Amino acid sequence: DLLKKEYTGITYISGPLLFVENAKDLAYGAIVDIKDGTGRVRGGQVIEVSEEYAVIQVFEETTGLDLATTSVSLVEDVARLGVSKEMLGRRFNGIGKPIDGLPPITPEKRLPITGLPLNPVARRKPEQFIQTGISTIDVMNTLVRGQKLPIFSGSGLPANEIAAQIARQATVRPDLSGEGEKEEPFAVVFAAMGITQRELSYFIQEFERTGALSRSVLFLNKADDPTIERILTPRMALTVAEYLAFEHDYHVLVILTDMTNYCEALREIGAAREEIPGRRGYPGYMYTDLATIYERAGVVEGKKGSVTQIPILSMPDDDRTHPIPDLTGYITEGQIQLSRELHRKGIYPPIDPLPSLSRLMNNGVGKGKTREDHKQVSDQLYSAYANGVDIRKLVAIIGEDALTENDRRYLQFADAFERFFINQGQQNRSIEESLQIAWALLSMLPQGELKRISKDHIGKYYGQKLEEIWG
Amino acid sequence: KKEYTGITYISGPLLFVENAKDLAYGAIVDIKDGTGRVRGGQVIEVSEEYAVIQVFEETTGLDLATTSVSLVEDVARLGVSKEMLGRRFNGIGKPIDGLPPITPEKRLPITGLPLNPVARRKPEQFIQTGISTIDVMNTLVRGQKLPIFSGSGLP
Amino acid sequence: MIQGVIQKIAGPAVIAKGMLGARMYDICKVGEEGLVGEIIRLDGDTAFVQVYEDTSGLKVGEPVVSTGLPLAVELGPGMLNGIYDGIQRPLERIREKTGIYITRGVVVHALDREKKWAWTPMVKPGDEVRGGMVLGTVPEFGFTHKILVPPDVRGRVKEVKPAGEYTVEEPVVVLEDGTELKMYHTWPVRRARPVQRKLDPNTPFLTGMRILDVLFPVAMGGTAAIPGPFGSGKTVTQQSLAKWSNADVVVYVGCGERGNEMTDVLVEFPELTDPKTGGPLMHRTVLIANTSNMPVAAREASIYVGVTIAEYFRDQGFSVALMADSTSRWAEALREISSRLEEMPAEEGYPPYLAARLAAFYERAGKVITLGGEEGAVTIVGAVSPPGGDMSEPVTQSTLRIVGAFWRLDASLAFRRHFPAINWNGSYSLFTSALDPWYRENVAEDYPELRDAISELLQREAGLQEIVQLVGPDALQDAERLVIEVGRIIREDFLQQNAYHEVDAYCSMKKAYGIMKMILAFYKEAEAAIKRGVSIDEILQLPVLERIGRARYVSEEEFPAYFEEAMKEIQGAFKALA
């Protein structure tokens, strides 16, 4: 329709909720406009409708509202976002309004922000290897195009720097796969939820220096912005990413700054509505709500585009069993976990290899894709590093002077591994250099102890000395 | 005999029936629906306005229009006899071995009266269980309560 | 039938008024779009409906129509080589009616009405028919699909159709009472299909994994549970079981998990080979898919549909294996609905009736004599996803008290890339003593003795590890260092298995028996050598260790020569020490 209808008779305002009685004409999930007595207009959404009264959650703060003059008017029945190809290079707030001073976009379509589930028949397996330039990711936790790979961080760990480095250095290798094509760079969709100025300025300066702002769409919700707007931002960011990737064949990389703030914003609404909580007070439906965000990535059969997600989240008191990391690990296809101990020693990036995992690693590596010895080298490195870490605990009891000759080899291997393979700085290693370093690290062990590697590769790559690379 | 048809609420294992103040607390009732199937139930609360019944089995076929409730017995009772040696029962007294039901010498409430502490006497005789680790070191005496603590996969 | 109007909408729950006369658990049509619903609570003139589709955009006042029947599934030919959602709708035809996204209100039939099947009658006019008897035979992907009388239909045959090609809607047999029997029938998903008699379990369910087949066996009609934290190996193990097991028909239920896992099955299975028939592997598999971002209320329906289909294939004389990807999501969905019902919750917010549902789901398995006199079996393997790996969860504890086998996974083993990462200390199996008469006749006469010796060695190694943590490995005597090293060899050779390797992914029973025999022979020779005077540092450098340690990758057809060479090499190596 083209008319407008206003509902008066608000009977309850408290916190983020608002009740209106005679609003039975409002559809469930609709978007409404709340008009103040001074003319200010605020947004809202219906979360429960009945013939007795309707419940509306308010995005902005409730200061200045009164029960005598406030009125509620309908905007649209289903929350929709106007998208276009021209929003590349623009900046928007948490609810989609421009904040760069340019005039508003002209839509080509209006798409629901909640999205729709992808048909499992229409999906296809992600198999394209992506070279990030980090040895601990490229070799042992390989990332493929179309994967959801979050980063598990801490309070003082440099997760933002790692994400910026990955976005700067990411590329595919068509020469290894035999295609011979030259690709085009990823389009970036950046969604910030409760971000601070200290990190936002760093991200802006990094994107300005790398020149990636002309290919980027930014959704910013700052720390002093209203909390309830964080419900919408991931949905609109993923709607734009899906539209671009599956209508214009772009390769889209999506970064979400902090899902912990999103979970707190969800817990506020859940506690306001007296929902049955899960563990640590979070609402019981948080798994489904987190699933409606993560599973919007992947690849689609018969289409060139793709969506890749790199969420970032902070672990409270570095606890892996906290509900947010627990459900994120249950939903996503792996994780990258940073270590505080490696950070204290000065190692950058401080990626801990043992708790990290990549589920789609087997699809994108092997013969004809990267190299024939990738997986076995990764397995041998994992086993040897685990043995060295185990010996580190025996040393604290019996002393390192009482060790056998065999265990000292594992201890020195662990030390050299930490000091050379993980620690790389800002340099951009290729996959071949990372494999060369890995083979140079495996050469310090006896040839008969490489149980997980076939003799064919051992006879071809073993024997290279680490001083030949760094000397 | 008498049937109550004032059902007003069904949700999960509970149902409410109005004007049922004649039902004693803890009684056993039969729930009948339009298809003729009969289910069991127990009264868990009696009031002036309605009574609350916990339903055995499942409540798939029930509806508020045709459901009726009839009384079976006010107190859960079991018929006992010496014919029961060699029989199998399903946990509420119904045979499952295929033999005809026994004829009861008496009907007793399943909840038992406490023993008078001045009526007991000290246990003084043992039971041969045939297991050396129980017979020799942890002997079982007639009148003892000797539990067995086990794990999950233990036999 | 009863009609009403919507009174209140709140998420996945809809309350309709004017619903007097409706019955519990009936299927309703909600709104102008005709969304599928189910009544779960009656209160006066109102009814409480949960919706199996998204409820965004609905308005108060839309009509609600009750069908008067519970949820049911169509059972007949054409179910193999297909994928269904939570309420049995084919996804391959939703893929045609809609684009790459799944939308609301799509009405498709479970069985294709256009395809014609070659009908071959087996009954004659004048014959007495009864529930569970066969009416005819229809070929399907190398099988022989048998048309079955519905379980509660009795009568006498009036006329039958001659041999020919008909659709599933064609009435082939007409009874004297006027009832027509088609090529399919409908059955409520919450009623277990009746049988004649249950039977004891005496035949093992071969999985292809050494540790599960040898140490913790499960019988053909048994049940098992595999709990563990995220990243421990539950899905890979279940898919390996789907690939390599000896079941005739495999039913897979993706209750609330990722969609890429179902995509992998849809893509890779048509290229694999059925082990016992030689055809494509997907021709024996039925998939039920309800991913994480699908509507919440359909998770229970997927489980019930899967178990009902698995029982339907049981009645035809097949042995069916049913895999449940996660039974914890079912409990979470129950908790989410219980939140919308405002009822009193249990220990961790779950409804109190959760254990009854879990018990009723698991007790549908077992080996039976069907109503037609044939023999069938259904075995259920269900995964559990505890929050944070806490095994004291109510769902984990409820499952522990009804299953026959328990395969606990460990995160510490998965961290060091030791797979299948089965925790030997916390796992058990109750079918071990009943399968011995099969093992003695089909594998070897001394196989249970070898298995018990291996278990004793593992127990002794587990006993010594408390001292190694206390005073270090070097303080032990050589006779105990031998036990420690043999335990390490067993752990790194026999128990470890790679599911993605070209050869090691599948292992027969005789190969595992040969490996166990080689390990025990080496241990006996080493124990004899220590008392003679040889230091242990001499023994564990013999080249026969590499011969033992790489026997995993030897192919099945080449193993008998390798075994006979290694057994001679053991004696050749151990006589030259002292």
Ligand SMILES: Nc1ncnc2c1ncn2[C@@H]1O[C@H](COP(=O)(O)OP(=O)(O)O)[C@@H](O)[C@H]1O
């Ligand atoms: N038998 C095995 N052989 C080799 N790798 C395995 C095996 N089992 C599990 N894995 C590895 O462990 C990971 C576990 O992933 P998955 O089983 O999908 O998740 P979850 O167990 O949390 O459902 C997989 O990515 C796989 O690479």
Ligand SMILES: [Mg+2]
């Ligand atoms: Mg899984």
